[PDB]
Amino acid sequence: ITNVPVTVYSFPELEPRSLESYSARHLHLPLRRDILHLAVIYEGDSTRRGMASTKTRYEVHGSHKKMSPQKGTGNARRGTRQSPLMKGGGKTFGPKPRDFSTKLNKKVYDLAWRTALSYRYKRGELIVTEDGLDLPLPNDFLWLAGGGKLSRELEDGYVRKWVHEFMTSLNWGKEAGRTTFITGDKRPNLFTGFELAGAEGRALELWDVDVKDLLETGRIVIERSALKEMIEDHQSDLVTRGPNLGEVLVRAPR
């Protein structure tokens, strides 16, 4: 079949409420290890700082006078003191601050983004959720935190406990790998809840996700709108002349 379904769940209860349809070239591509490899190694080269510096014999401090007479000493002839053979000499082929970044075609990088997204779809590790996804922290606790009655120490000591027992019930905690929450924008509860308890998972903004982030944890919990915006930006391989992108087969029962 050319199109594959994508169930949309309600994050708190994980109830299937809507059904969307995506192309088979979006979430059902063959697994290409070479293509995924080239996109992961391409991202590491860009994150590298590449600033290591070393001095050569033409940069080491000191005078370029000849150390000893050419003849008559009875020792090996020597020139300047900055030679690689001397004690404090410079490294000939030492590291220098340069650019470690490589290039990768946009169409190849966009194929690896959808190949890593299909690897999670066929394994059941891609759980799309309705927009607005945020950790449903208790209401009374949120009333105290905002009030300022609770201290910072206790405010963090509770979130760490709730997030732990909330992720173990869902079997999404450190036991079953970890979870990555990908939302459109930053959310207070979600992002602040996974900054204090990071062993259970992490949260990321759509603009801060890489092909490597889609393969690290155990599952990817992405919003409905975020997923559509991720495939629309990484379909340069497909739309060059369309394919089903978020078509609603079953609408939410208002």
Partner 1 sequence: ASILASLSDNRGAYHKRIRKGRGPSSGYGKTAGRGTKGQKAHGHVKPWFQGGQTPLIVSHGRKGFVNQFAADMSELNLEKLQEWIEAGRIDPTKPITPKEIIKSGIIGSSIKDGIKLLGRGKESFKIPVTITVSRASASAIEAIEAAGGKIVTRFYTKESLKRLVEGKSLHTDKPLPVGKEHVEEILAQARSLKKKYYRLPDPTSRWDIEYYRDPAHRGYLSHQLAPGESPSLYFKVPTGGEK
Contacts with RNA in 115-154 (CB under 7 A)? 148, 151
Site mask for RNA (CB under 7 A), range 28-47, x = bound = ------xx-xx--x--xx-x
Number of CB atoms found within 10 A of residue 17's CB: 15
Contacts with Mg ion in 54-113 (CB under 5 A)? 88
- In this chain, which stretch among 15-23, 93-101, 152-160, 211-219 interacts with partner 1, using CB under 8 A? 211-219
7 part of the interface to RNA, by CB under 7 A: no
38 part of the interface to partner 1, by CB under 8 A: yes
Contacts with RNA in 208-237 (CB under 7 A)? 212, 216-217, 237
- In this chain, which stretch among 65-73, 164-172, 219-227, 246-254 interacts with RNA, using CB under 7 A? 65-73
Least Å distance, CB 122 to partner 1, is 12
- In this chain, which stretch among 9-17, 106-114, 133-141, 227-235 interacts with RNA, using CB under 7 A? 106-114
Contacts with RNA in 170-189 (CB under 7 A)? 174, 177-178
Spatial separation of the C-alpha atoms in residues 175 and 168, rounded to whole Å: 8
- Taking a C-beta distance cutoff of 8 angstroms, is the pair 108, 39 a contact? yes
* Residue 71 or 251 with smaller CB distance to RNA: 71
Contacts with partner 1 in 117-176 (CB under 8 A)? 119
243 part of the interface to RNA, by CB under 7 A: no
- What residues make contact with partner 1 under the rule CB under 8 A? 33-34, 36-38, 40, 119, 212, 215-216
